[PDB]
Amino acid sequence: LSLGFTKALMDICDQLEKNQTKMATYLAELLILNYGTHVITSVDAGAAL
Amino acid sequence: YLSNRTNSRVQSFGGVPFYPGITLETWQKGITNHLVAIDRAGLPLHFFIKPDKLPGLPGPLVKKLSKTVETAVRHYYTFNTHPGCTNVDSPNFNFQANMDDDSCDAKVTNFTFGGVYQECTELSGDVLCQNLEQKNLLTGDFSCPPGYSPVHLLSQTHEEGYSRLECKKKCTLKIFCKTVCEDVFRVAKAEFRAYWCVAAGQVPDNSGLLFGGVFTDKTINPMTNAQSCPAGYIPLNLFESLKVCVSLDYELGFKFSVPFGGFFSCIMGNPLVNAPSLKKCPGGFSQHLA
Amino acid sequence: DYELGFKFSVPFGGFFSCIMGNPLVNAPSLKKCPGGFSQHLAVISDGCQVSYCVKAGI
Amino acid sequence: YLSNRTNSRVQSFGGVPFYPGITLETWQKGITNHLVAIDRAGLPLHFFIKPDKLPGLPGPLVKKLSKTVETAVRHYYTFNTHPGCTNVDSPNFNFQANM
């Protein structure tokens, strides 16, 4: 994983260990808003016209 | 009476900045860089939240974390993950500890008033009926769908002239005949009767649908911020120049629908409330021009 | 053929036009979309839309 | 009443980026690199899980491992290896410890 991704992830994990559900779920929502709902594992470098 | 009409539309992504006089070649040779992801595939990110892919962290806690992230997605996926309200749009009177960006121009709370219907009446000649026939889709002909009411949106008339076709043979004195081809002027007219389709009462979800998207060739579609139909929309050209887009499928409509209502012209009536006793804007939705 | 269909089939159903009837249930007594499969467009024919009931099981 | 109708469809893989005015030659001469696997053949990967091809590891355990991998393939091969459900598509209401 990237650096920022791991940062956000272990941040939510510290929120869950810190039992703060509200801030935790909001941080997860921010994560999904900030990193999208899917990670790409394949693209096709090309062009079209 | 000469009339050329030329169109052209290149749509390239992505090479060298296109320009009309370009060859079909210098495009290609200039593709060295300027590559673009033309197709892509991946996985749901919850799949990537696993103890192996993560550094030293407690085992079951990453299970907790994956479930939480996945549920957050789920929330954001089905609806706009609403704990209390739409928040970022007009942050004035909203509960904004969450994230939610439904829409802003809401002024009515009316119901799912689906359906699309009209009437193309001919006044003279047979020209305009063939192209101004914006027949209903929900029935396959000129009708409303069950549970809906084909209330008259607006009536209107036009007057256009086409030099028709005329290849007719004429006998001189029943012995010989000549074919006198002579195309003649004619002002045809059609009375365009639009009939806005609106639900009568509570809809059964089996045959009650929601839609959205209206614009002309001249007026921009603020729905999509374009002059075409958004993905998953047939542009139903109900009006003289409107192409009323249809959310014929749930798929992305559930999150891009904007559950509209209906309204006649300012001189015509209206379908909903603010037994024919009322005639004025059906509820709220102040004059947002279309 | 079975060969790759078994994994790329999407075990569809059938459906007439919105004005015509339908083959399945939701003795001719019913006339409306055969089961579920909300209006997933496939083609329009002079006003009527032609769709199906395309199941996506195993 | 005149009506031409022309089609054209090149489909090349893979040489120099094709373009209509290209000769049938400058295509070829420009194939120096831009090679592409036009045909391929291999073996099932379970065949490659064998104690010789593997470094120091317990003998019968690699037999276990090969059988497990092969069965996983089998699962993924016939159907979509379903323990409980389709999982990654719409991850909302699915059992997603599998694939």
Ligand SMILES: *[C@@H]1O[C@H](CO)[C@@H](O)[C@H](O)[C@H]1NC(C)=O
């Ligand atoms: C966390 O919150 C739950 C629910 O309020 C509570 O039962 C628990 O004691 C709290 N602390 C820990 C360490 O789980």
Ligand SMILES: *[C@@H]1O[C@H](CO)[C@@H](O)[C@H](O)[C@H]1NC(C)=O
């Ligand atoms: C445009 O009109 C001219 C006559 O002015 C005609 O010769 C020509 O074929 C028309 N079309 C184009 C593409 O030039």
Ligand SMILES: *[C@@H]1O[C@H](CO)[C@@H](O)[C@H](O)[C@H]1NC(C)=O
């Ligand atoms: C196209 O039409 C022209 C006449 O305008 C004709 O001479 C020619 O043979 C047709 N076909 C092609 C490929 O140009």
